[PDB]
Paper text:
Using a fixed-target approach to high-throughput serial sampling, it is demonstrated that high-quality data can be collected from myoglobin crystals, allowing room-temperature, low-dose structure determination. Many thousands of crystals are held at known locations on a silicon chip, which is rapidly scanned through the X-ray beam in a few minutes. The combination of fixed-target arrays and a fast, accurate translation system allows high-throughput serial data collection at high hit rates and with low sample consumption. The low-dose structure solution from myoglobin crystals mounted on silicon chips at room temperature demonstrates the realisation of SSX in a sample- and time-efficient manner.
The crystals on chip 1 were SWMb-CO in space group P212121, while the crystals on chip 2 were SWMetMb in space group P6. While a desire to minimize the absorbed dose (though defocusing and attenuating the X-ray beam in the case of chip 1 and reducing the exposure time in the case of chip 2) resulted in a relatively low signal-to-noise level, the indexing and scaling of data was not problematic and the data extended to 1.9 Å resolution or better in each case. Even though this is an encoded move, we added a small dwell time (1 ms) at each position to ensure that the position is reached and the sample is stationary for data collection. These travel and dwell times mean that the total time taken to collect data from every position on a chip (11 664 locations, as this includes fiducial positions) was 10 min when 40 ms was used as the exposure time (chip 1) and 7 min when using an exposure time of 25 ms (chip 2). Chip 1 resulted in 2576 indexed images, representing a hit rate of 22%, while chip 2 resulted in 4264 indexed images (a hit rate of 37%). In each case sufficient data were obtained from a single chip for structure solution. The maps obtained from chip 1 show that even a modestly loaded chip provides sufficient data for structure solution. Serial approaches therefore provide a means of obtaining low-dose, low-damage room-temperature structures at synchrotrons.
Author numbering: 1 to 154
Amino acid sequence: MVLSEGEWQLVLHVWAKVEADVAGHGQDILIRLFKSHPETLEKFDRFKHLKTEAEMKASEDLKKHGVTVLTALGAILKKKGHHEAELKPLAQSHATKHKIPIKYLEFISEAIIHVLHSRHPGNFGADAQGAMNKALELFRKDIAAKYKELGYQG
Ligand code: HEM
């Protein structure tokens, strides 16, 4: 897959709106993931005790981890597909330490798309949605290929 230049423009234009409140977006994405797919919370030893959404929102450490996640993701998107070097340390930890199947990346992709709609009702159009889905799909496919290069089945 390949994005057009105009699609990357839409992606980066939307990302500038994420960067204006990274913690608010990161916390919302994690909570959306955990409510929609509670099997994913069990991978997080530090947060697995959180049970209701109200608990999650008051957890300072969950919000900080949201920043960690979106910070890494934004660095990758900003490379517009030339991201082999940023992917490697990410692929290495999530395949071999955290043991995250690629299916869980699809789930966080859907959570990102939902939170962008919830947080930007008027800005996040169909074309922007399309471009973001493609950027995230590319991310998932290249990470699945790095899994295999490390000898893992994602
Ligand atoms: C956009 C997708 C994602 C990005 C950019 C991302 C990024 C990161 C980063 C930067 C870290 C900290 C350092 C590290 O261990 O690598 C981390 C930790 C972690 N990630 Fe992810 N991640 C993503 C998706 C996921 C998903 C979907 C899961 C599981 C459902 C997951 C599971 C974990 C776990 C379990 C840790 C360790 C948490 C801790 O500090 O105790 N990641 N991630």
